[PDB]
Design a protein around this ligand. Structure first.
Ligand SMILES: Cc1cc2nc3c(=O)[nH]c(=O)nc-3n(C[C@H](O)[C@H](O)[C@H](O)COP(=O)(O)O)c2cc1C
Ligand SMILES: Cc1cc2nc3c(=O)[nH]c(=O)nc-3n(C[C@H](O)[C@H](O)[C@H](O)COP(=O)(O)O)c2cc1C
Ligand SMILES: Cc1cc2nc3c(=O)[nH]c(=O)nc-3n(C[C@H](O)[C@H](O)[C@H](O)COP(=O)(O)O)c2cc1C
Ligand SMILES: Cc1cc2nc3c(=O)[nH]c(=O)nc-3n(C[C@H](O)[C@H](O)[C@H](O)COP(=O)(O)O)c2cc1C
Lengths: 368, 368, 350, 355
């Protein structure tokens, strides 16, 4: 029955906040609120957003800066801007073109696609959208070790150059919108189907997580690293000691995230946790940051705070809903141009310059 | 004619906050507002709730955690979760099965019932509900010493294995709702009738507190302990010197509480007072915490901050209003499952692990 | 033309904040807003109110306290509770009985009436209400020395036991309500007619001429407390004029500790600007004040019920403070002065 | 483009009200060009709320009467410690344009800052000024010789200082203008929507050396928020520091301008004068800026709203409002003169705007 939008078009993006209410008009109610909502009464989602006001950028002048360069490299991938696509389940909730739509946007823009293990599209379908573009695969682990070896082998054969272990979802967050909507997936999840008691199609996220592994330990990081022979990111980190644990267990990257506030409730805004994590990582491996990035100023602040790249999520999926691959592309294009302005005004010629920026501490918070 | 709800059934519970509005639909106006309301313009009731955003939980990963155990023990009672029922007067305002209904819920769930001296039900009617389950008796002291000895004897005979002295209500708080509604009890209080010079039934709360003891001193604690031979909690503690006072006077537990913000106004949120009290207590006796617990995240935060258990109040009474014993049971069950999720996500295998959690300090407020 | 309320009745006071809205319905718009309004967009008036949430009271248990005594003494006067009436001219906006109505409430209650030298009522009307009760007189400095000597003499002659010199009003505050309402005070007995160039000698000279103890009123900076005492002020009145004067200044309560620290108990401290609750009286005492002064809530009581309505507000404050003493473990007023307070760095939204 | 043309004195109870009043007489695009700021305007609101961070003390028995607002800056005697900020395109607000503003300013008795993006010629503004003092604000061209030309034509007009605005190498993200598709409805004679783009991006400390080297005049570097930039600009030959965030129209999610001022003033250490702008709306704000290290403030938006409502007379009503508003504040804070204001204690308010 599920009526996702199908129109493909470029969209004007004045800011990404506006994209939420615009997408609400064309995405089915249940799937829309699955995308936009968060745990509890969403205080931690708001904290993700308001955390950006805690550290403020300085305009800098006579900086000898012209035509700032947004390109950077991560684990040997040359990318057009210091952002990648976050792994997000079930893109068919936003658009009929689903993950193949997002992939085409990401590949044509020139950055990395993260593929969710809970994708509604097959590796084949996503691949067609990517048309050779770089991809990282995000695993939600099976309890069965051989099923993990199989999923990993499949992802690597498909072209994955890194594995993302998402470990902050051993059980579902208390997502009140989905409870109240009795939200259930309107389609299957071909990559993890093998460990579900049928198809994801009738099921709640609660029961899908939880078919997944609960008893994740540092051993799983060493094992995934060992088996795949690929660099492994550990995703969902908010406490510095977990970054140290992950690196000691063989991780090649740290991915700071609170899952866009969809997991543990009454936790800090993700940005506030980043400096402590970056201090503990001590440059040993690259850091991806996510959860609340909406503006070029947010990309800059994350890099100035110890991140190497950020990952984008909800705004790209809202762009997807509004215009397919072209809509998603408009959002990526927006972020690149937004960051370019910020770079010029802050005195940053290149991405490495962003990493060195002074930030103004704002002890007053949001209301100032 | 007090028309209290009488239907008995389990209820859903997405969050406890929503229970308040739902119960307002079925509880008479005067009694509902007596349960819901607090002192002054209720700024301190809001402070109780907002204090939970001062200390934030970290999600933790690769912890090596599966199927967390919420069971614990207090003063020798094995309980199924680290929460007990708070002593609350006049449960007949919420539901026709009154205190016997709450007792049945509490006993079936498998935790401790606290019986209010201002119960609308007799020890006998409660005992029927408890069916042998553990109970603690909360006294509001008579001015007459013999009457106290008799109340305590009756409590101990009925099966009480601890006594709670509530000492923060020697006069009533400024409860604006009840003044504006001219609230008065619609039924009697059997346990304390002996000192009311009549029945609680015509009476304002102002005047029932007024009949109880005002000149409580540390000797009262010693005398209750000496007479009953039961461990004594002192309830209402917000200042660390009161913890020292109480222990020196023979108390076997400290119960940190601001009476659900129903007493002194323009005081701190209760959770903000707990660390100073726990430091002062220095593990000499158990600590019970209450005043604003609404979520599994709050149980975890209270324990991480030096409580051994928490006491639940308003949400259980709204639950009783909505479905009698089964509705109250649904609330207890919600808290146990809510805590179980929180334990999985924070890395806590058992209740003692919650007590050692790191908390992120949030110096910004509620508005972040 | 001015049609103040004239009805005389006791009123139920659940809290004093509700009294403003209630009063607005029986007092002419212009006059009502002259009473209620403050400078600029009234951010400092809100600061006076929200400052109370910066220091929070503890409940205290097993304190051996039974029937707290609210009574106290200030420069010789035995009063039933540690609050007095603040000097306000224009009670006539609130009620036909003007300053005489408030004087009667204050006298029957058993505390001190501060009488402005600007009052719309004649002293003889006022003296009827006072019925022997104590009174202090508030003045502004005139530009003309003989006017001052004359007004001072008149105050002494009228039974005054202290002089309150208000010096925070050398020019008016920027009161937007009064400007937008084109409000014109209708009664006889301004900032500009009075003395602008007030110096410490003015206090010395008022101290010399009057036999009486002099309060300096409007203090918010501790250096002015030093200055005043050195000049023969027998008391410090901490006030920001109900936020009707300097805009974008601190809430009055936030200034109290630093001033009390400097005064070092040399002279009594009266605190005002924002008192609405018994909790507020407790908090001001715990922070260094000896008594507080009441303003707006009494005037709203006067609008609603004349002397009886005003008495209902004073009675409210006494019973409110009495609850706060019982629960904080204070047997008496000296106990309030020694209370621990909880620091709330989160402020109003917590 | 239907700019208002009515000339009259106006009532000013406060400058905040002027924004809604002007909205009713200025065309939608132009008005929102003037009123608007970057992003969701959080930093514009920060500019305003920053004033609640440091609070004035009233003071008693201070021996004060008839406060003197007059001061002096770079050899100019002005009647109050404020000047007119350089604002583009005054014809958006009123048909009399920069000449209307220039008249109010000159008649009130302070300094006119002329924007490189003015829609009036030097000669039209000169007529409004009638010999009054003027400073000129340059948006640098990419060609060195054309800057030399502009600076010559400015100097020859009578500019006694040069203001280099260096915080606009590209435009801020002004959502109102994007949504309205704002385009200028008239020319800019001094430099003749993609302007900024044509102007110089790669500004360096060399440029400020070269502007001072070439022109006669003391150079202000405008748009400073970071104390390292004030040091840089002094090292480079600037004779003045102009602390500004361009009224929040440039970098978004940056501090309110007033919160940056003490750190800049400390680093300047009285080496050169400091002009402060971005959010000044009350006499209390002029006071607080001077108490925090500024020598004068620059006024922007309220003056333009005044111009929209009453041409030169409206603009004058605003300048007069600020002068009287400051006078009251001076009386109540115990300040006899401008130097007094610069020594005032401020109460620190760690609580927000919400207190
Ligand atoms: C609709 C939705 C689905 C998501 N699904 C996954 C998932 O399959 N795997 C995963 O690791 N993260 C998932 N995430 C979390 C994202 O990877 C990322 O952490 C989050 O989108 C960042 O927050 P933001 O989009 O608000 O900026 C999901 C997020 C959303 C919005
Ligand atoms: C309706 C109502 C009645 C109460 N009656 C009593 C009482 O009889 N004895 C007592 O010690 N505490 C009483 N309390 C306080 C509770 O024990 C407990 O401190 C409070 O409910 C905790 O706040 P919360 O329910 O908002 O979490 C009462 C609270 C409310 C809600
Ligand atoms: C309407 C009004 C008139 C006032 N008139 C005077 C005045 O006559 N002389 C004086 O010293 N203070 C005057 N005050 C200030 C009061 O004495 C006192 O400082 C103020 O009422 C305290 O603020 P609050 O009433 O909000 O608590 C006046 C205040 C208001 C409300
Ligand atoms: C309509 C508008 C146009 C402006 N044009 C210029 C400009 O041409 N050159 C410049 O240096 N500053 C320009 N500014 C910034 C002002 O010089 C000044 O920094 C700002 O107005 C101060 O903020 P405020 O008006 O909100 O107090 C402009 C500001 C606005 C409001």
């Amino acid at each position: 029955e599920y009526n996702a939008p199908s129109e493909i078009k470029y969209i004007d993006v004045v800011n990404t906040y506006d994209l939420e209410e615009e997408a609400s008009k064309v995405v089915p109610h249940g799937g829309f609120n699955y995308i936009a909502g968060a745990s509890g009464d969403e205080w931690t989602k708001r904290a993700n957003d308001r955390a950006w006001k805690h550290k403020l950028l300085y305009p800098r002048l006579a900086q000898d800066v012209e035509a700032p360069d947004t390109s950077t490299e991560i684990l040997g991938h040359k990318i057009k801007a210091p952002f990648i696509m976050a792994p997000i389940a079930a893109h068919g909730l936003a658009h009929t073109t689903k993950e193949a739509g997002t992939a085409r946007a990401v590949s044509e823009f020139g950055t990395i696609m993260s593929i969710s293990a809970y994708s509604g599209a097959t590796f084949e379908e996503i691949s067609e959208g990517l048309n050779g573009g770089p991809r990282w695969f995000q695993i939600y682990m099976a309890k069965d070790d051989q099923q993990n070896r199989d999923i990993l082998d499949e992802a690597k054969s498909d072209g994955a150059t890194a594995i993302i272990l998402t470990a902050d979802s051993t059980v579902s967050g208390n997502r009140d919108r989905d409870v109240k909507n009795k939200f259930v997936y309107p389609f299957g999840m071909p990559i993890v189907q093998r460990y579900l008691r049928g198809t994801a199609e009738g099921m709640s996220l609660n029961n899908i997580y939880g078919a997944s592994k609960q008893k994740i330990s540092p051993r799983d990081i060493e094992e995934i690293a060992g088996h795949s022979g690929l660099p492994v990111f550990v995703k969902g980190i908010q406490h510095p000691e977990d970054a140290d644990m992950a690196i000691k267990r063989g991780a090649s990257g740290i991915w700071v995230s609170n899952h866009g506030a969809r997991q543990l409730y009454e936790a800090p805004g993700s940005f506030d946790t980043l400096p402590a994590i970056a201090e503990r990582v001590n440059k040993r491996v690259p850091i991806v940051f996510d959860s609340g990035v909406r503006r070029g100023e947010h990309v800059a602040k994350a890099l100035a705070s110890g991140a190497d790249v950020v990952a984008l999520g909800r705004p790209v999926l809202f762009g997807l809903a509004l215009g397919g691959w072209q809509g998603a592309y408009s959002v990526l294009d927006y972020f690149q141009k937004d960051l370019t302005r910020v770079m010029q005004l802050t005195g940053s010629q290149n991405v490495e310059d962003l990493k060195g920026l002074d930030l103004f501490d704002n002890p007053y918070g949001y209301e100032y």
